[PDB]
Design a binder for these strands. Sequence first.
RNA 1: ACCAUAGUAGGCCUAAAAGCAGCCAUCAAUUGAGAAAGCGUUAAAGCUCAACAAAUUCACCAACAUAAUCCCAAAAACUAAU
Lengths: 222, 162, 176, 68, 38, 97, 131, 45
Amino acid sequence: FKTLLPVPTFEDVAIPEKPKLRFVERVPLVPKVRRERKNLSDIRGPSTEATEFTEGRFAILALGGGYLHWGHFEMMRLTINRSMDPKNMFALWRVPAPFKPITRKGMGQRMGGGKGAIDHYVTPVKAGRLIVEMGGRCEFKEVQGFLDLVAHKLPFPAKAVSRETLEKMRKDQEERERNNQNPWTFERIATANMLGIRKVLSPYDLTHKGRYWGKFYTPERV
Amino acid sequence: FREVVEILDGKTTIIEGRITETPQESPNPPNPTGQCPICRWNLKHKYNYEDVLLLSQFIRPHGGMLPRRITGLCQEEHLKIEECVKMAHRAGLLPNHRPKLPEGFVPKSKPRLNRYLTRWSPRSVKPIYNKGHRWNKVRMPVGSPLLKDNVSYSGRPLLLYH
Amino acid sequence: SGMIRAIVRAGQARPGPPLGPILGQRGVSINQFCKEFNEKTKDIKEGIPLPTKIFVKPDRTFEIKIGQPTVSYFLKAAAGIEKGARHTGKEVAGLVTLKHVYEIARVKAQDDAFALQDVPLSSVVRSIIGSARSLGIRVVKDLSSEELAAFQKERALFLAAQREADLAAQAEAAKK
Amino acid sequence: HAMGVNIYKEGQDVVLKPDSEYPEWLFEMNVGPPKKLEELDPETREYWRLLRKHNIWRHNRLSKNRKF
Amino acid sequence: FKTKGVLKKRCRDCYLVKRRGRWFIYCKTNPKHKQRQM
Amino acid sequence: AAALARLGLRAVKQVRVQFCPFEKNVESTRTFLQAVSSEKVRCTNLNCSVIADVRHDGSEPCVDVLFGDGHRLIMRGAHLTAQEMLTAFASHIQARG
Amino acid sequence: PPPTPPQEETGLVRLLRREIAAVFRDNRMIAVCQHVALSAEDKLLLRHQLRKHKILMKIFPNQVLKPFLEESKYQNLLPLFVGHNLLLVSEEPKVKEMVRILKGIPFLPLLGGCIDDTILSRQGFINYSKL
Amino acid sequence: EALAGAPLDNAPKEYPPKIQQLVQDIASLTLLEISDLNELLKKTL
RNA sequence: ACCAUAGUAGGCCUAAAAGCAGCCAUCAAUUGAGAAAGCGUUAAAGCUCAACAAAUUCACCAACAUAAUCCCAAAAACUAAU
Ligand SMILES: [Mg+2]
Ligand SMILES: [Mg+2]
Ligand SMILES: [Mg+2]
Ligand SMILES: [Mg+2]
Ligand SMILES: [Mg+2]
Ligand SMILES: [Zn+2]
Ligand SMILES: [Zn+2]
């Protein structure tokens, strides 16, 4: 004998038309003629934009920073589109089409001579940004199962999350940092310039607080 | 402790259960409120692989670990006691708890290498041919990390790898 | 060597598929069974295909148990229609009342499956109703005068929709 | 075969009993509205049939990911 | 036998076993499901 | 009940189970009864009869099984567990037959 | 241990309690017979052979049947339900007719029971039968 | 309350208390109350 | 561990679509078992899942090959160390 439990029911879910992901273009329609310098600073540190959910209850969350080029968009589009029930689920791009020109030279060039030519386009993705947002009358578990594939084939480390999962790990993140037993935290030492440590740190560190190092992000770092 | 007896008489076979006497938990524990058997005797973080009088209480006459739901151990401590029992078998303590096999005592093998605190099984370990230099160095495990919480009287943490 | 479920029309039993591949694979005589089956089923002049249970034995001999005909047929006739709805519940196929389902029920209470079950006729009527839901056939409490007002409207709408579906199927057969 | 039934033909092809002959249960049964979960009383046996059925649908959706 | 970085059961009859300081997948029905963790 | 089905019970003549329902110790023997009474084991051979002897007073539960080796296997479940009875049954009645 | 988390009765538990409370009222003969694995065919046949003498059969979970029965006047049936079981319900009983069908199947034991407030073993059923 | 404990075949010599106090209350009656008893039982059954 | 019977081959399109090419409904017997979550069939039949009953230690994720003369201090889990 086992007693039953009430099943979660979705009466409030409204499925939009064209639930499957839009095709995105290899190159923008108005190709950038002027060659841009590479901010690596756009992959660096925490993300400001696209941190929260909008319509959907599920998402892929980026744990590192990285560049997304057309190959990745293709991968996600196909993989998600044939992995979903178009009736019961819908997906959404939380990331723009690749807009940032990246140059190259022909292999075999000597150093110098000018900048290179535009090879392809990418999208910058800062750690903590939602890549793809899936809603529906789905339970998190199915979506999670096939979303983790996609997540795994992305250039940065990433996870599949729900609203519940995300707020879980955020409350855990702050609770870990008010639980902390040792008096010595990165913030505390860095801001007050103890041991003259500011010599070895970068200015950005004051904001990043030793959680972010380069494009990498370690969540365990308080 | 219930022995199962089997008898063969004239093409008839009798199998029967028979109950013997079980010793009982010693009368007066230090922490009676205590939940798990290790804990109410204040043995948590105290017993080592070396303490046999404690370990021999959970095992079978043939040397294998007793199951957990029978013993009542707190899960963590069950694992610790299992590690310890393995390590103690390997160390050559509990010689009476092997299975008895009249033929196999006769065929000598090279006299048993004396060892202690062995985390892995002897047959499963590849010799480390390459060592490695000061910066990338292959360390040889000693004892188990399950016991890394034992009380240290010296104050220095036990050294688990050399 | 096992059992066989064969749904077969009243006066029709022929030494070819389904009976050829099915009974012929078990190593069972097709003609003996056509003979016996027709002996028993020629006495039903109501023209009803019945699901039947054929027990096929180890020695290649056999036994036969004839059950009540399918509810699909009984309801196809009760609504007077031919084929059931293409898209069920989206559209209507035919109409029935209390009385239809009651009759069809007390007819099928002697079925092999509902025989051993001591269930009242309310239960069997529930089953037949549910089997109407998926056949595209709609029940109504007291419909009689509106039954015929309906039939003169409804049949014209089913003719309109079956002709529209036949024409659109001619256009989709041509486009293909 | 084929039968076109009118008010003359549906009565002439059938033996259709009077309204006082037919059992009470036959009118009570719900014609077209299959019942929902909220509608049924939790102290009724049928409510729990529906809950079971829904649990089965749930396990059935969740099992979509089977490798085996 | 295949050497793999990730072991996964390819059917219901696969079982998972630790031998020689490794993990293994043995399968009696389909021997092609045999796997050795590297 | 499955491990008995896989083992081809056809080597057995007659299986009786004598037990006393109102005793506290009989659950094991009962488990054995429902393991041998199952459809798989029951249909492996039709030459074998399964008899359930039910008494209030006998006070000792017992399982008796004859088979065509001229062999008689009698296990008195008192303190014996179900799957010990069924393992003993398997290795005893299969290896001999 | 952590403090005590009292569990709450579901609708299912209450429905079963009510149902069994009615079952022990109505039927004069309640005969416990250990549930035994049969073909679906044979179980149906047995149900129908119980339908011929009008006797009914019922099955409840030991979970909700046991505490009800230990708090019942019927608690002497507690040692009977420890295994699998099947509850034989009879209104206006005739026991010899119930024994007739059980006789057909040798491996399907009748264990305890109560016939008109008289709690009996199998032998008591054999005695009430010949009466 | 609780019900009977069901004695059985190997040893039951034990008859109920009710039957005995009934045959006692029967045996203590004078024959006019025995004929009255007999009539009152003949009519109901 | 255990167990699997009911309307019924649900209605359609197709040579056949019988829980399982596809489209639509997704009701209903039995204490209990989806108009079926995996395998399987030409269509079946046949194996399992979820359902009753039987019981109940704990069970979410986590594992990743290598180079060229010869491995590369030796060794070591406690007698008290801000
Ligand atoms: Mg990656
Ligand atoms: Mg149901
Ligand atoms: Mg199951
Ligand atoms: Mg290699
Ligand atoms: Mg050296
Ligand atoms: Zn403890
Ligand atoms: Zn496999």
